[PDB]
């Protein structure tokens, strides 16, 4: 058995009505439990036993179902009901949704940083490419070495949806050896995301 | 209710560890706890309950045979030992408590109190102290500046700004874990251009795991500097 949340990831604005459904792939029981998240922190009991608000709780989250479609609904969320959340019965944990703030589209503001002189110093160049306070989420970084598209050599990270504005964050880390960052000379990160009509690419040429 | 659990945990590959997790605020023998664990960004998985009562167990298959649960009532504590670990077993482990008494002999298996959780790193890494490098701000509008606080091990660092007193348009990231087997993240603020002459930035680099601290100063590049 397994147990499928829908959706993956649900946006949605304060005062709006949320559904989320999870669904078991066979029928374990008719006890299901919802659990809450928020970063950094240990899940929280919303509904046990399919229908019954944990102590707590307000009244807005309410859950229903049996067999095996079940379904948590929120009647106007609240900025503190930003968070994944979790279906459970026995050993079977759903694998989430996220439920996050949708607001208007934001381009990212994008910043290029040449490798520091000290890390130069060790043997290794880090390139970081940053794409600040955007929405929504989805974002594509390119970097180009001497016009030569990157593949490979790359890692990223993302924020957690900020609390305040409800933009993403990224950083994205070229990893070169030193000799090959002295061979060449221009950087460039290339950022394409919905808020921009066209990508946008941000460089510097090594030395200069 | 409270549910206290030990401190984070360092191991190699091949290694057991075991987690306590301390009960208050309740009769410790009238509830299953369960073990619940959680690897970095992904979701919840169940490992298993011991009855405190009885000491009776059961483990999830993905461990049976790895995995030993046990408690003292004496001092109302539960324990999770995971043994031949794996980089794998990388995770947060919680402790949550059930919502009914086992005299009930109801439905065991809503969680309604859960420990604050326990990091165990596994990895053939060994505890190591990050490089921090500037990252210079990136003009003479709106500039951005940071730390990128490279080669650490293992999780968790902490950074602030200017002691604390700088927050607005701090971003810092998760950490990525680099195929070395260290972990490397940026911590960047972005800042008003004009400000760059006049005013310090200083990063504050905590990684209480190796006992090191380190404030960086970030300053213009000598190419953008006027005195």
């Known amino acids: 058995i397994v147990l499928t949340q829908s959706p993956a990831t649900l946006s949605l604005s304060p005062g709006e009505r949320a559904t989320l459904s999870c669904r078991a792939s066979?029928?374990?029981?008719?006890?299901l439990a919802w659990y809450q998240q928020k970063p950094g922190q240990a899940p929280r009991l919303l509904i046990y036993?399919?229908?019954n608000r944990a102590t707590g709780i307000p009244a807005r989250f309410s859950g229903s179902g049996s067999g095996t479609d079940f379904t948590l609904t929120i009647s106007s969320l609240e900025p503190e009901d930003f968070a994944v959340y979790y279906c459970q019965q026995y050993e079977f944990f759903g694998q989430g949704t996220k439920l996050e703030i949708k607001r208007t589209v934001a381009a990212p503001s994008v910043f290029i940083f040449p490798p520091s002189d000290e890390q130069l110093k060790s043997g290794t160049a880090s390139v970081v490419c940053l794409l600040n306070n955007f929405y929504p989420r989805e974002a594509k970084v390119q970097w180009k070495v001497d016009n030569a598209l990157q593949s490979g050599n790359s890692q990223e990270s993302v924020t957690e949806q900020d609390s305040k504005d409800s933009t993403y964050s990224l950083s994205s880390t070229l990893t070169l050896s030193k000799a090959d960052y002295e061979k060449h000379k221009v950087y460039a990160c290339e950022v394409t995301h919905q808020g921009l009509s066209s990508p946008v690419t941000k460089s510097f040429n090594r030395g200069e | 209710v409270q549910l206290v659990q030990s401190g984070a945990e360092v191991k190699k590959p091949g290694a057991s560890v075991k987690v306590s997790c301390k009960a208050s605020?309740?009769?410790?023998?009238?509830?299953?706890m369960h073990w619940v664990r959680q690897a970095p960004g992904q979701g919840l998985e169940w490992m298993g309950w011991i009855n405190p009562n009885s000491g009776g167990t059961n483990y999830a298959q993905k461990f049976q045979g790895r995995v030993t649960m046990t408690r003292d009532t004496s001092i109302s504590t539960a324990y999770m030992e995971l043994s031949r670990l794996r980089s794998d077993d990388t995770a947060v482990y919680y402790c949550?408590?059930?919502?009914?008494?086992?005299?009930?002999?109801?439905?065991?298996?809503?969680?309604?109190?859960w420990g604050q959780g326990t990091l165990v790193t596994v990895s053939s890494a060994s505890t190591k102290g990050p490089s921090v490098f500037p990252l210079a701000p990136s003009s003479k509008g709106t500039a951005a500046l940071g730390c990128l606080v490279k080669d650490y091990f293992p999780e968790p660092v902490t950074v602030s700004w200017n002691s604390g007193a700088l927050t607005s348009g701090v971003h810092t990231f998760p950490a990525v874990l680099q195929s070395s087997g260290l972990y490397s993240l940026s911590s960047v603020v972005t800042v008003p251009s004009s400000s760059l002459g006049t005013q310090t930035y200083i990063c504050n680099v905590n990684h209480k795991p190796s006992n090191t601290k380190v404030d960086k100063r970030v300053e213009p590049k000598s190419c953008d500097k006027t005195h």
């Open positions: 036993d399919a229908s």
């Open positions: 066979q029928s374990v029981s008719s006890y």
């Open positions: 949550a408590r059930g919502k009914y008494c086992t005299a009930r002999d109801y439905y065991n298996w809503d969680f309604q109190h």
């Open positions: 605020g309740y009769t410790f023998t009238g509830y299953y």
